[PDB]
Short mmCIF file of C-alpha atoms in Angstrom, two decimals:
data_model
loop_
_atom_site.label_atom_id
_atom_site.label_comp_id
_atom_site.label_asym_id
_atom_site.label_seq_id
_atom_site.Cartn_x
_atom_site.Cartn_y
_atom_site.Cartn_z
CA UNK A 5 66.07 12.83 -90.57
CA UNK A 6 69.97 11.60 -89.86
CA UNK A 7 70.35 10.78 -86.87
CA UNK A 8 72.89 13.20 -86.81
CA UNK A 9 70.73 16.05 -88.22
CA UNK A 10 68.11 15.33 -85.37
CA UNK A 11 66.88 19.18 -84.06
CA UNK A 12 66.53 19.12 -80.88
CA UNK A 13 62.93 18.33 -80.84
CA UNK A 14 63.73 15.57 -82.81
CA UNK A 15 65.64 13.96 -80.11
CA UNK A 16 63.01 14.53 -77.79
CA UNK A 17 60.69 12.37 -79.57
CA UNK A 18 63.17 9.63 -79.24
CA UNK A 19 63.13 10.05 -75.61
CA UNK A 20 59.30 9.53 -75.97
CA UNK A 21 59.58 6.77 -78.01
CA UNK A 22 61.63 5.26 -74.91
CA UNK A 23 59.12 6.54 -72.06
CA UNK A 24 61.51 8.71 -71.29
CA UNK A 25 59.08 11.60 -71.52
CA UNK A 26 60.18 12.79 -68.44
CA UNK A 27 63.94 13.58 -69.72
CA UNK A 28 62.47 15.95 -72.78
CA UNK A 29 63.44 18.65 -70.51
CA UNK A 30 66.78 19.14 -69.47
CA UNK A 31 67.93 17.24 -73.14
CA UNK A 32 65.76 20.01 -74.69
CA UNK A 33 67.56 23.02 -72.58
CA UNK A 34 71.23 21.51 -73.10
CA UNK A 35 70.66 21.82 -76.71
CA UNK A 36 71.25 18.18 -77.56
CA UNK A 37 71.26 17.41 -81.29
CA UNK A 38 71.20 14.68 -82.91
CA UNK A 39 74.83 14.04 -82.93
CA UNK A 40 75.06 15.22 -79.30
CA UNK A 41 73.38 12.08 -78.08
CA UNK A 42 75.65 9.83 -80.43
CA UNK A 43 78.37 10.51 -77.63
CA UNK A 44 77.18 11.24 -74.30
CA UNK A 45 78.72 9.23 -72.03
CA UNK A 46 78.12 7.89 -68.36
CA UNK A 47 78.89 11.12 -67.02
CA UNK A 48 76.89 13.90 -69.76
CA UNK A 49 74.25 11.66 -68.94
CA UNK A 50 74.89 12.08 -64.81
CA UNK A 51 75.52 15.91 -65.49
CA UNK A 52 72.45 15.46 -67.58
CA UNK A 53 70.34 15.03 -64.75
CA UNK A 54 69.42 11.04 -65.07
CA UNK A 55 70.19 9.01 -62.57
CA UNK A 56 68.31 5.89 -62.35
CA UNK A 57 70.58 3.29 -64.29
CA UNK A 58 68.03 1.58 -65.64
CA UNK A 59 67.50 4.93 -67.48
CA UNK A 60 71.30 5.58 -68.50
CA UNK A 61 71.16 2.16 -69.97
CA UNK A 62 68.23 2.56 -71.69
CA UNK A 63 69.11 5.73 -73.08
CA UNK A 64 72.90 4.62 -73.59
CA UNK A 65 71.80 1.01 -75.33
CA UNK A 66 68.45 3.54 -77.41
CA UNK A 67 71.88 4.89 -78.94
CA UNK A 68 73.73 1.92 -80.30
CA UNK A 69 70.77 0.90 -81.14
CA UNK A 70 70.64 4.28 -83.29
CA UNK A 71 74.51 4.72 -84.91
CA UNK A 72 74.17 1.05 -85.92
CA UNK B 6 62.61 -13.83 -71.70
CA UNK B 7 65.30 -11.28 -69.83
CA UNK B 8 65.14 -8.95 -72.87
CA UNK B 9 61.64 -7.88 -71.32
CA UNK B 10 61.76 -8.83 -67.67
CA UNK B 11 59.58 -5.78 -65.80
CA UNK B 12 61.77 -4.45 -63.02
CA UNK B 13 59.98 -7.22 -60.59
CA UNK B 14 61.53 -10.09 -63.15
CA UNK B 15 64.84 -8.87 -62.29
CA UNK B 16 64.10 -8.93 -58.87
CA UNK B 17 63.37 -12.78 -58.56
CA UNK B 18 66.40 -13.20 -60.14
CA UNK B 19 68.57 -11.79 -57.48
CA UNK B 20 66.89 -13.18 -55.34
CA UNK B 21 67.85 -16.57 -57.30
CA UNK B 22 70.64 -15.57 -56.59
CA UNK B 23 70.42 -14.68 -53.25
CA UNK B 24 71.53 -11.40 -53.81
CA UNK B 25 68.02 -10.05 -52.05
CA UNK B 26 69.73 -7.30 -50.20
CA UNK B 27 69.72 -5.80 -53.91
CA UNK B 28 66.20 -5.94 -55.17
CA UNK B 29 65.69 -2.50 -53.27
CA UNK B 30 68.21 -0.37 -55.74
CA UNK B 31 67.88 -2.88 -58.96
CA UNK B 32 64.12 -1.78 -58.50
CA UNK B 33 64.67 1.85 -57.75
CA UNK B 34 66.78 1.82 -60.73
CA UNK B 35 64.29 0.66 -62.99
CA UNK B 36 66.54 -2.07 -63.49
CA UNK B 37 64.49 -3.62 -66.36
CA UNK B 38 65.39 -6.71 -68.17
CA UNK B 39 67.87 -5.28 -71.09
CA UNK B 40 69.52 -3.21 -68.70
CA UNK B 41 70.70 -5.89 -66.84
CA UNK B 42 72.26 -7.25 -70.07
CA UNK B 43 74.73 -4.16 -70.21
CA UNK B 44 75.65 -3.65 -66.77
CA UNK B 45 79.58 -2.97 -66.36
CA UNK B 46 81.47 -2.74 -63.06
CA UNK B 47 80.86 1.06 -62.52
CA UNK B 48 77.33 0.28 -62.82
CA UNK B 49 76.95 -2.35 -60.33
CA UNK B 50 79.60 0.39 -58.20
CA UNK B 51 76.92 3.12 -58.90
CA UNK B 52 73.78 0.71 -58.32
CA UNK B 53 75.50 0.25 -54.39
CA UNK B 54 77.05 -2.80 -55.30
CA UNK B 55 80.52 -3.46 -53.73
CA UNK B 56 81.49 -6.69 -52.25
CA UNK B 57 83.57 -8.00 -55.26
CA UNK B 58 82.27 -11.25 -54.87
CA UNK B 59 79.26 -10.77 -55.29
CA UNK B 60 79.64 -7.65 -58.37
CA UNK B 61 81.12 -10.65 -60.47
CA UNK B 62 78.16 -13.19 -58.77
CA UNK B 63 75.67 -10.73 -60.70
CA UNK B 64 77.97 -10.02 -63.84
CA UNK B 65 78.24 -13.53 -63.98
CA UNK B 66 74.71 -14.57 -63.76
CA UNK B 67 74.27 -12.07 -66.81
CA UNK B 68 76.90 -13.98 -68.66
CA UNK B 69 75.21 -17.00 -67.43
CA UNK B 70 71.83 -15.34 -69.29
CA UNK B 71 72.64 -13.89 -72.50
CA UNK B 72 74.68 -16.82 -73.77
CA UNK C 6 97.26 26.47 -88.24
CA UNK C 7 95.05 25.72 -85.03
CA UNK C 8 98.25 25.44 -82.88
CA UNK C 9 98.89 29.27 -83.31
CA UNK C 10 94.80 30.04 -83.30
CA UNK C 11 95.19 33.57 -81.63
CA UNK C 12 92.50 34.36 -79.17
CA UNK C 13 90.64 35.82 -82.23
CA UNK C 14 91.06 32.58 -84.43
CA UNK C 15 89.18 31.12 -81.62
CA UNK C 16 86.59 33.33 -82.11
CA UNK C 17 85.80 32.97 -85.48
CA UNK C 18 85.99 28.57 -84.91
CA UNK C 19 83.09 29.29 -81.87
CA UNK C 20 80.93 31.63 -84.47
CA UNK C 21 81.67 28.71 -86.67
CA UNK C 22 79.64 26.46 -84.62
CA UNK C 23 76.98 28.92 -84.13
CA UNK C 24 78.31 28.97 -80.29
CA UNK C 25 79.00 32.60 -80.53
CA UNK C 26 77.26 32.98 -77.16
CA UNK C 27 80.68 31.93 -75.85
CA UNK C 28 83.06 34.20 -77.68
CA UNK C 29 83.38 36.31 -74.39
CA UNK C 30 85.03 33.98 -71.85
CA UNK C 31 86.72 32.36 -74.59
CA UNK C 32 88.51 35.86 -75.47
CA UNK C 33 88.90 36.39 -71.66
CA UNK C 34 90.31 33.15 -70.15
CA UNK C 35 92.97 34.22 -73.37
CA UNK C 36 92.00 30.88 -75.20
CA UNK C 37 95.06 30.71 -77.30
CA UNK C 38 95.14 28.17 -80.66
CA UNK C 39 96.92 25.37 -78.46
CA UNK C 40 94.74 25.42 -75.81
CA UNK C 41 91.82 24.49 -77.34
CA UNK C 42 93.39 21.86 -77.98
CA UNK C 43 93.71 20.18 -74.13
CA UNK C 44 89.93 21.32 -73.16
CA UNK C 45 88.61 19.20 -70.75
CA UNK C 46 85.34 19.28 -69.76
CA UNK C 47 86.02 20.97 -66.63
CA UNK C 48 87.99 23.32 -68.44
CA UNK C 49 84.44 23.80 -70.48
CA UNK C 50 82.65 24.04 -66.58
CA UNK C 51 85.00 27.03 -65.34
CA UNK C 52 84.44 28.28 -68.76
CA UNK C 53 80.90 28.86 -68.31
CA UNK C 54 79.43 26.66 -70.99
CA UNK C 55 77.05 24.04 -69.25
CA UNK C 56 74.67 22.57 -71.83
CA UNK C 57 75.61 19.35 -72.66
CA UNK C 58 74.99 19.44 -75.84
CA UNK C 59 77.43 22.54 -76.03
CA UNK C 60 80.21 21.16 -74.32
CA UNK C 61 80.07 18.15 -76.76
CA UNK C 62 79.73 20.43 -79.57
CA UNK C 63 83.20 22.26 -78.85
CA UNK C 64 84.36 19.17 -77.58
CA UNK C 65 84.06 17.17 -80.99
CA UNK C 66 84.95 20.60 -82.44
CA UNK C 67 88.54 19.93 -81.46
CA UNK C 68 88.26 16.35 -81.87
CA UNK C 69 87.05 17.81 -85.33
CA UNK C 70 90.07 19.90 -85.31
CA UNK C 71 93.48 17.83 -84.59
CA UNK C 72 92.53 14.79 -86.11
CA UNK D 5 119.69 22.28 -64.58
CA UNK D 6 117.00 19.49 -64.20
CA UNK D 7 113.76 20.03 -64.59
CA UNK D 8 113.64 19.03 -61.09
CA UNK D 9 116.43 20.94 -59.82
CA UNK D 10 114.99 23.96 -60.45
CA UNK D 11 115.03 26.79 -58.06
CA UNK D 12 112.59 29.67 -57.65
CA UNK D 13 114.11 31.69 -60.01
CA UNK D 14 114.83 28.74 -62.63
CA UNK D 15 111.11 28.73 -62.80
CA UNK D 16 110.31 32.49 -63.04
CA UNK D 17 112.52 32.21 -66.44
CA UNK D 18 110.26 29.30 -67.50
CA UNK D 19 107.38 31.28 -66.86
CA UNK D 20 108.71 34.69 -68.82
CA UNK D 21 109.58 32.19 -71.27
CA UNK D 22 105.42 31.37 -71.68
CA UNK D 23 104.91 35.53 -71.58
CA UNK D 24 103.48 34.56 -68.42
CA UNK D 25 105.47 36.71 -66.62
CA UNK D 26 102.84 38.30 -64.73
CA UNK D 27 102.88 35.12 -62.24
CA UNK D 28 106.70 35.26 -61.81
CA UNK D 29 105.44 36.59 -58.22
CA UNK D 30 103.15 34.65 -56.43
CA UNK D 31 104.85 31.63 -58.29
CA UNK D 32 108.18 32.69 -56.18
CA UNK D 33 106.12 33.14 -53.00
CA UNK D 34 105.00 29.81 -52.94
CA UNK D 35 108.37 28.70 -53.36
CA UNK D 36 107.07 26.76 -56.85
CA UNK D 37 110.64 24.84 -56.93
CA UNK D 38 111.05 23.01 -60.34
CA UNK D 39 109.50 19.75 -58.88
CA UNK D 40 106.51 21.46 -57.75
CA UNK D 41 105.44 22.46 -61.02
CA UNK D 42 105.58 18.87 -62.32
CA UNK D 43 102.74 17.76 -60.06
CA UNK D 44 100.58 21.50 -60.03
CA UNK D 45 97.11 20.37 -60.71
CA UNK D 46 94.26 22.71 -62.20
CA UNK D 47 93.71 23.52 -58.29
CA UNK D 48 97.56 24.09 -57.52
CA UNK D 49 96.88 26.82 -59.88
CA UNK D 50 93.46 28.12 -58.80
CA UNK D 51 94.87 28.73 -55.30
CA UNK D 52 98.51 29.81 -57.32
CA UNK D 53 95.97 32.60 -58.73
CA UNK D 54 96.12 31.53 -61.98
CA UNK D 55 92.23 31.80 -63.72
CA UNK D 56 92.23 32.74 -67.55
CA UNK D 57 91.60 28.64 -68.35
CA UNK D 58 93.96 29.50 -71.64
CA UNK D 59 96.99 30.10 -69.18
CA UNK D 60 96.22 27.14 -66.48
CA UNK D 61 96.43 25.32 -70.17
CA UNK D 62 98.99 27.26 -70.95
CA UNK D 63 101.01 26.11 -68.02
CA UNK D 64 99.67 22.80 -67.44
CA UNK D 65 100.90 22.33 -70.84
CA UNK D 66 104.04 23.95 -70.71
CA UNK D 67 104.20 21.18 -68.01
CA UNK D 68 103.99 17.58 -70.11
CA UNK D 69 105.67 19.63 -72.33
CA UNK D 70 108.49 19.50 -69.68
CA UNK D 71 108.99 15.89 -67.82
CA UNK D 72 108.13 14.52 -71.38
CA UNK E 6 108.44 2.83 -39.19
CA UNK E 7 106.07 5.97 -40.61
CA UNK E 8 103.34 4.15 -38.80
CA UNK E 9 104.51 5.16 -35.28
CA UNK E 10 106.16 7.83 -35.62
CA UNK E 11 105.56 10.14 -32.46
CA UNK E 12 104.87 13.78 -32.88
CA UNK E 13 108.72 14.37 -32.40
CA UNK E 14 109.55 11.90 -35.55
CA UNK E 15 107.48 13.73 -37.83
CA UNK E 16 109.36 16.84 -36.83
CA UNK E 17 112.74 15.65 -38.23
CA UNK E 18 110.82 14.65 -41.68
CA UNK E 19 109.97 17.95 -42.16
CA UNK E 20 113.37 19.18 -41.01
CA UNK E 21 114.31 17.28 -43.35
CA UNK E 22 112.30 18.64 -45.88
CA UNK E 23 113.47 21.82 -44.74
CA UNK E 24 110.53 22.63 -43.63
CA UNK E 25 111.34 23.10 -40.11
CA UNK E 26 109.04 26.43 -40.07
CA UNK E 27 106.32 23.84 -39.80
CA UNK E 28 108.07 22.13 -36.99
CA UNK E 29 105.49 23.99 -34.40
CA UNK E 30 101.87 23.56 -35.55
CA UNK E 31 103.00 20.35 -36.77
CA UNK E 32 103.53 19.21 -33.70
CA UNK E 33 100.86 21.28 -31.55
CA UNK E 34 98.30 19.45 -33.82
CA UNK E 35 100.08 15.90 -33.13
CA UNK E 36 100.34 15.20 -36.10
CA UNK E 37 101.31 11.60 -35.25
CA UNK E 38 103.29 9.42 -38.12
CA UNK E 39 99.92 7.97 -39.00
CA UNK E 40 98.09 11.22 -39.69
CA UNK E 41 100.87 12.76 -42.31
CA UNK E 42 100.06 9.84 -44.39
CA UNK E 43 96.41 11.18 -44.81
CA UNK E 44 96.80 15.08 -45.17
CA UNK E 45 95.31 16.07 -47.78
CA UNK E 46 95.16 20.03 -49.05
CA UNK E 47 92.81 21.08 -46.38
CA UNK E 48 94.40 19.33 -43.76
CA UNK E 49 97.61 22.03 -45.06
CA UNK E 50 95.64 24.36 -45.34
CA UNK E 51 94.31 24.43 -41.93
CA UNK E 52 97.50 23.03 -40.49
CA UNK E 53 98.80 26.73 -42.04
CA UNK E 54 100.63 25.67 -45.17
CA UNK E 55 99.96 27.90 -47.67
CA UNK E 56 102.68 28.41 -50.05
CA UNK E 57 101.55 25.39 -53.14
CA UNK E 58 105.09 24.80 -53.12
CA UNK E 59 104.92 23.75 -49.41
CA UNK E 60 102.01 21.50 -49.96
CA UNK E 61 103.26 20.16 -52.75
CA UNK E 62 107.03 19.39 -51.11
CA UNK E 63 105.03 18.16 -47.74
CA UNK E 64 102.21 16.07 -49.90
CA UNK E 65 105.05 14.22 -52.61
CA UNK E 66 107.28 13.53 -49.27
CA UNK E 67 104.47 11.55 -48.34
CA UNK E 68 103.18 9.93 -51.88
CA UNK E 69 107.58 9.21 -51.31
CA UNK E 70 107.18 7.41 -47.72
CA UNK E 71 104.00 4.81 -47.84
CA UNK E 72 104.73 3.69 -51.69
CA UNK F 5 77.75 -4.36 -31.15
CA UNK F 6 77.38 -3.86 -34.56
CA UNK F 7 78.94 -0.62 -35.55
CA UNK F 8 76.14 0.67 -36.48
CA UNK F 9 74.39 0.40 -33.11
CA UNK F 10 76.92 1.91 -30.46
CA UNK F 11 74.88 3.58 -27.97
CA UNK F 12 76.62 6.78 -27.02
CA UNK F 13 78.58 4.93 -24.48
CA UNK F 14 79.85 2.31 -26.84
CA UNK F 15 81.33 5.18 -29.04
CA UNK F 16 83.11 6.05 -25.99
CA UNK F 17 85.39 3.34 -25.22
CA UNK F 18 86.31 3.48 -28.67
CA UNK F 19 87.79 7.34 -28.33
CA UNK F 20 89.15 6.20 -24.96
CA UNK F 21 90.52 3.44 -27.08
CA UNK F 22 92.05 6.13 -29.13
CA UNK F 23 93.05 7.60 -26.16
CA UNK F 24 90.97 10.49 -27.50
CA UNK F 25 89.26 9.97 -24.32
CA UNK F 26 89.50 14.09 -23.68
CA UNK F 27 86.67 14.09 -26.26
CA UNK F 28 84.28 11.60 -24.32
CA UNK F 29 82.44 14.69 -23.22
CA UNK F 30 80.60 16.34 -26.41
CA UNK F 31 80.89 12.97 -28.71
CA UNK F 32 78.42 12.12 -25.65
CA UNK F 33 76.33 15.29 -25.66
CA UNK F 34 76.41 14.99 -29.07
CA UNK F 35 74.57 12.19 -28.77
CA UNK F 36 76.95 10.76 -30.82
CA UNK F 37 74.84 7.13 -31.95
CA UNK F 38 77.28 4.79 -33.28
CA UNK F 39 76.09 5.45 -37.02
CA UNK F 40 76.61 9.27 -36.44
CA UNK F 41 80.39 8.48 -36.34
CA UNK F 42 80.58 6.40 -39.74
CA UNK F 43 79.88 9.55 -41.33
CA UNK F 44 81.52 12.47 -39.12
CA UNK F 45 83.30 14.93 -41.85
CA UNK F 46 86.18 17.32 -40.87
CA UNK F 47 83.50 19.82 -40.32
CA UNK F 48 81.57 17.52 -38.06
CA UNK F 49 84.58 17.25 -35.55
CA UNK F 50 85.06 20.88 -36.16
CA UNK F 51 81.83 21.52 -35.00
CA UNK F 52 81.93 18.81 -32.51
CA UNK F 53 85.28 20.68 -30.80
CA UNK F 54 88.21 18.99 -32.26
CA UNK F 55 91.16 20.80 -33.54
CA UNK F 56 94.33 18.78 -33.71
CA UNK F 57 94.36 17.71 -36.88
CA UNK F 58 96.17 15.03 -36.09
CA UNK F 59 93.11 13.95 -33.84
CA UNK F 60 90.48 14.93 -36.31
CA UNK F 61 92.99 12.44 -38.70
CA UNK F 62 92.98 10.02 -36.04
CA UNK F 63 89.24 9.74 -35.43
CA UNK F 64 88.32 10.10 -38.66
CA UNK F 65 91.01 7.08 -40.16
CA UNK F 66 89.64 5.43 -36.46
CA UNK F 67 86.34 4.98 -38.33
CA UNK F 68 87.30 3.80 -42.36
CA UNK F 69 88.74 1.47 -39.93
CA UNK F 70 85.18 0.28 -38.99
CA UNK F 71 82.86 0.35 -41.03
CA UNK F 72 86.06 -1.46 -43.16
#
């Protein structure tokens, strides 16, 4: 289960685990792994499809929150 | 506490602040408490805010909330 | 050495990712050793790839790859 | 010869001198002096023609590799 | 003073430039000292510049008259 | 007067006041409220019958000038 090993349906639960349900999507079809979300930044996250701040910094801050 | 302030929480705040003219965005944003916590200038830039004055009012009132 | 990576070293680096799926453009747009090296991730928009997670994969690939 | 100082032609060699030869043209007909190329930007060369990514890298890096 | 500059004072700039070729639409457009200061590629572009070079030699002549 | 609420006459003066005052015409058929202007884009003026760059320059650095 490291975090960096996380298949892409792994991640998704994450999401889930944020009520982020609605992000399962896109993060499913760009094939992010585990490790992928370790470094998305501002922008991956804005090419990524979410917008709503609140929701970058909930899934930015659901990542230091991982690493660490 | 902030840590769990619903997106309405926040919104008293600014208005504490009389930064009012904000709760529209902060809400639509889903602003919740934590976020708050982490905002950074491009945030407040990309949540509409601009007048300098006023990005470092709300920075600061985060300052003024954590510690 | 990377820095002399002909278009075919490339190649083998992608397959080593499992990003074969990319080989193509990579061979086309003549993706030398060096350049690589200087991606950006426009450079990874005009070169087709577009999931995140992809671009990031190459991405730390080379970060993977210099360092 | 300064990097700067370079005319049409002091370019071209620059070019051949990348095996990018094949540009020598349109890189003369938009009178690319040596200046010029210090400041083309990936669009410069997107309207220069250039589109293999490996040679606007290839000459964008030929580039730093220049001033510097 | 760049800021005033009437159609006519532009004109020697670009003379200047040797870029007196431009001299007309330049000038047709009145393209007023004011204006240069914001072309940007399209504004070339439709202005008729074409060759980079041009742009580029126009666009730096200006980057070298505000700063 | 607030920028934002120049009837189509109030946008007026301000072209005459550019001395753009040749344009008076369509910016008024236009209907041309005073919000419409704050976000005019080259293709706007294109559409709208300017030409002269140096005019579409002119109005267009006439209104970062406002709202500013």
């Amino acid at each position: 289960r490291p975090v960096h090993l996380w298949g892409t349906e792994e991640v998704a639960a994450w999401l889930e685990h944020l009520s982020l349900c609605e992000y399962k999507d896109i993060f499913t079809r760009h094939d992010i792994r585990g490790s992928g979300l370790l470094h998305l930044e501002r922008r991956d996250l804005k090419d990524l499809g979410v917008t709503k701040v609140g929701h970058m910094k909930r899934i930015l801050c659901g990542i230091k929150e991982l690493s660490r």
